[PDB]
């Protein structure tokens, strides 16, 4: 009922589909991450530390392959530039804690990414950079928190944490104050779908990959537990 010139086309289609499936199988192995940051933040510094149109990087740890994307633009309005990303497992976010002037506006930025309609099932990893500059600024005493933030004086240092309080109570005071400020917006309307992992890092740190790996493992575990109804 069908001529041979149609059977040949059907055979060609089947052979194309087989190779298509075979080539598409390999894509699920690797993992993907998106990088978002502002100016004056050492994004390229940590990128180069981890290494050893749209710029793309790839690195391998413990027989696991990670791709990391960043986009260079000055639109300041995200729009469809974010509408594409709906499958990445995490969104690395890096700020600068040294310049006391900009933190407030940076806070507003966070809110947008926390409340975007499309990004309702994506977890955010938060980094804080330039610890040494903050230490020197608080040691010198030229600038005070009360000048820019007047709730600092009434606040008190929380107990039973003491990671490394040998330097001074003041540095932990500022650290935990900033951490609480950033965590409050995240916990205001989390609803349990996505949560935030704070961290502290410096310019010469070299253990970032292990932390990224651990948090990715935790994210996948939390997804699987919800998948199998156990939670």
């Amino acid at each position: 009922t069908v001529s041979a010139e149609d059977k040949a086309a059907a055979e060609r289609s089947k052979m194309i589909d087989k190779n298509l499936r075979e080539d598409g199988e390999k894509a699920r192995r690797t993992l993907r991450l998106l990088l978002l940051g502002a100016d004056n933040s050492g994004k390229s510094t940590i990128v180069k530390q981890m290494r050893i149109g749209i710029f793309e990087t790839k690195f391998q740890v413990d027989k696991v392959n990670f791709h990391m994307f960043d986009v260079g633009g000055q639109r300041d309005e995200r729009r469809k530039w974010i509408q594409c990303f709906n499958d990445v497992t995490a969104i690395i976010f890096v700020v600068d804690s040294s310049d006391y002037n900009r933190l407030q506006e940076a806070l507003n930025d966070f809110k947008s990414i926390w409340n975007n309609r499309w990004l309702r099932t994506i977890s955010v990893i938060l980094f804080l950079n330039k610890q040494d500059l903050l230490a020197e600024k608080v040691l010198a005493g030229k600038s005070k928190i009360e000048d820019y933030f007047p709730e600092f004086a009434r606040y008190t240092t929380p107990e039973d944490a003491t990671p490394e309080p040998g330097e001074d109570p003041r540095v932990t005071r500022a650290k935990y104050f900033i951490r609480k400020e950033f965590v409050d917006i995240s916990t205001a309307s989390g609803d349990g779908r996505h949560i935030c992992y704070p961290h502290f890092t410096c310019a010469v740190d070299t253990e970032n990959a292990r932390r990224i790996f651990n948090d990715c493992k935790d994210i996948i575990l939390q997804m699987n537990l919800r998948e199998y109804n156990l939670v």
């Binding site: 699920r28 696991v64 493992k217 996948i220 575990l221 699987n224 537990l225 199998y228 156990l230």
Partner: peptide, 13 residues
């Protein structure tokens, strides 16, 4: 299958 899925997140894939 449930055990191997929950305990090993990435290797079991």
């Amino acid at each position: 299958d449930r055990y191997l899925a929950v305990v090993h997140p990435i290797k079991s894939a």
